[PDB]
């Protein structure tokens, strides 16, 4: 095992000092990375120096501690954001909002720094591979728009506040990326992401049925109604909530034409109903029979069938992404985003080098491993039942012919004697 | 039972039983409640509330009693096992619920002092939406409009607020995720895990039967209410056998071992793989012998 670990990572002068892990990643060979040896090596790197001035340094520059510090900074920023949104804001921002804005601005600067680390188009193409980093940029742009709008006169400030309120949701949901590190959680997130296509295919049909029912209900009643714009809302509004247990029992089949004295009041004569008002309830049944009991159970069955395959694929993919996570957090500076401005002002390993004797030793070990592999492969092949049967049949055929030749020859001898 | 100088080892062994820890904790809470209940009025109701909260543990403790039944015990074990997956679901549901509640609270009530009600308001309404309550009254209130109503003078409502039409839309997406996406995933997880958990639970219960039986064999006859007399008085599994019976048992064991080895060898030698291997080897040897005779037979032709 130790020699395997050493072989997996060592500079190759012939191949541009690229270790086996880098080549496997470039080839996207998930099986190689998912192997136990590579996973153990990645875990060893994750713990950095601890693996359980110099005393401080080993703890400080380990990737795991940097990950924890970044996570804590993010959590604090999130807490401040919540406090800001809930409480009233004056004309000028408070200290908390200044801190939040500075954090966002520095994070955007750090994203630009990652972009730049004349090939810029290739760098952008590579960067687009990370889907999270696109939504992050979009959310930052929306936040900047909200900030610009919030500092104007009264008519715009509330719009800026609403922009903040809508934007907070993305940052609240971004915690899935942080959770990704956990063994159990990451695959769960991947499966959740995968199921959304089936969810959308269900949604289309549900939307069709809901539109039909809403249009029918709206048309049956309110005969003399001007177009306006409320009709489009009314179509979608009521039926959508019926999926979740609200049936509006008050206004299913109103009494309409009847005498309703009620109590503590004079008798009131209600309108004499309308033509074809008894068809709405019946329809309201069929819709509920379809949206609730038919499609949802089908979706459940689809999930059950897809679960196993999605689980396996997600596990392998997360084991593959571990390496990118580890290297990304190894490269990053120690100070969390709020204070990385100093690191950027200052701005303004994976592989271990080995001695010649060790290189020759590793080469010898590799050749020995190859020889053992081929010998074992041949031994397994020659012990297969099919090969043994084939050899037995061929040798039996040859023996039969030789036996016949001897028998015919033995016949000649009888005459000789 | 703890006492039946090794006391640390006894405690370490005792901690293995998870029920016996919660039992002690509940007893301590009950003692605290009893002490509080006998003071003046301001504390007596707090003691009563302590009793009311404590009763739940004793009501749920009946699962241990049910454990003896063949069917029930495995069910309890499976229920206990599924809670990890339940927790993993709960974390994500909590994240989504917090996001929705904070958004709803922030969109409305712009001029609101911090106080402490906000933390409640965030969690309160969204949690119940999972179970069929949508608060139809206060989804999209009419706000800015004329509402004469009846048996009353005309009342002019506030002119709504900016961005109040975004809350309903959000309220849809949340419901589309919490209710139809995560729950069905949890159902699928349960379906996949059921078989393995069932088998493991059956085996584990069959293992725990012995501990149950011995524990209740050792205990005194009188139930706990009257065990004080037994303790004041305080203040089998194996049968002994004769020598001849011991020798007989040893002979039977040796015979069983001999039969086991003989049957194992008989099964091994009748395998198809071994027969094919022997056939091939003997055929090869026969072929060589046939060739040797044939070459030798050629010599004889010259001899004749
Ligand atoms: C309402 C909430 C809606 C959606 C939240 C669910 C998040 C889905 C999680 C998807 C995770 C995922 O694996 O896809 C990732 C995409 O993540 C996303 O979907 C983020 C989009 C969330 C937008 C939410 C906007 C909220 C505002 C309204 C990319 O995967 P990768 O890391 O590039 O590599 C994976 C290799 N196949
Ligand atoms: C709300 C109700 C919450 C939980 C009730 C569900 C009870 C789960 C049953 C767990 C049974 C179980 O097997 O775990 C047992 C643990 O039992 C428990 O979880 C008891 C904890 C219940 C606390 C309830 C507190 C209620 C007050 C609020 C230990 O197993 P074992 O006998 O030591 O050996 C088993 C070998 N693996
Ligand atoms: C996972 C993260 C997002 C934590 C949850 C976010 C918010 C729900 C929490 C985080 C810190 C909390 C605050 C901590 C301190 C205070 C001040 C405190 O108000 C008072 O001091 C006045 C007391 C009174 O008059 O009653 C209570 C509310 C508030 C804003 C709390 C309300 C809810 C906050 C913003
Ligand atoms: C899919 C299956 C299982 C449905 C089971 C229940 C339905 C058959 C019930 C539920 C609600 C009922 C409706 C509730 C109210 C009315 C108004 C009622 O109108 C009248 O009879 C008076 C006017 C007239 O037609 O003369 C006609 C039946 C209808 C549609 C009822 C017919 C049967 C419905 C659709
Ligand atoms: C996930 C899919 C299947 C959702 C299906 C139904 C939704 C599209 C419906 C349900 C409730 C509807 C909302 C109910 C009320 C309103 C207020 C309405 O506000 C206005 O148009 C007046 C002010 C203005 O914007 O000019 C805008 C649409 C909205 C969010 C409706 C738009 C469509 C919604 C989200
Ligand atoms: C850009 C990624 C991240 C991050 C991601 C996972 C864990 C910790 C931090 C962030 O999104 N916000 C704070 N700084 C960061 O680099």
Curated annotation (Swiss-Prot), chain A:
Lineage here is:
Eukaryota, Metazoa, Chordata, Craniata, Vertebrata
Its predominant location is membrane
Question: What range of the intact protein is shown?
Answer: 741 to 1271 of 1732
UniProt subcellular location: Cell membrane
Q: Which organism is it from?
A: Mus musculus
- Please, one GO biological process term? calcium ion transmembrane transport
Q: Which residues bind 1,2-dioctanoyl-sn-glycero-3-phospho-(1D-myo-inositol-4,5-bisphosphate)?
A: 183-184
The protein here is known as Transient receptor potential cation channel subfamily M member 3
Q: Which UniProt keywords apply?
A: Calmodulin-binding, Cell membrane, Ion channel, Ion transport, Membrane, Receptor, Transmembrane, Transmembrane helix, Transport
Superkingdom of the source species: Eukaryota
Membrane-crossing residues?
A: 64-87, 95-117, 131-151, 156-179, 195-222, 278-303
Curated annotation (Swiss-Prot), chain B:
Topological domains, Cytoplasmic: 5-17, 67-81
- Which top-level group of life is the source organism from? Eukaryota
Question: After gene disruption, what is the outcome?
Answer: Trpm3-deficient mice exhibit clear deficits in their avoidance to noxious heat. Trpm3-deficient mice display reduced hypersensitivity to thermal, but not to mechanical, stimuli in carrageen-induced inflammatory pain. In the chronic constriction injury (CCI) model of neuropathic pain, intraperitoneal injection of isosakuranetin or primidone do not reduced heat sensitivity in Trpm3-deficient mice.
List the transmembrane segments. 18-38, 43-66, 82-109, 165-190
Q: Where does 1,2-dioctanoyl-sn-glycero-3-phospho-(1D-myo-inositol-4,5-bisphosphate) bind?
A: 70-71
Q: Which residues lie on this side of the membrane: Extracellular?
A: 39-42, 110-126, 155-164
Function as written in the Swiss-Prot or TrEMBL entry: Constitutively active, non-selective divalent cation-conducting channel that is permeable to Ca(2+), Mn(2+), and Mg(2+), with a high permeability for Ca(2+). However, can be enhanced by increasing temperature and by ligands, including the endogenous neurosteroid pregnenolone sulfate and sphingosine-1 and suppressed by intracellular Mg(2+). Implicated in a variety of cellular processes, including insulin/peptide secretion, vascular constriction and dilation, noxious heat sensing, inflammatory and spontaneous pain sensitivity.
What does the sequence similarity comment in the record state about its family? Answer: Belongs to the transient receptor (TC 1.A.4) family. LTrpC subfamily. TRPM3 sub-subfamily.
* Subunit record text: Homotetramer. Interacts with TRPM1; the interaction results in the formation of a heteromultimeric cation channel complex that are functionally different from the homomeric channels.
Q: What is this protein called?
A: Transient receptor potential cation channel subfamily M member 3
Which species? Mus musculus
**Gene of this entry:** Trpm3
Q: Fragment boundaries within the full protein?
A: 945 to 1271 of 1732
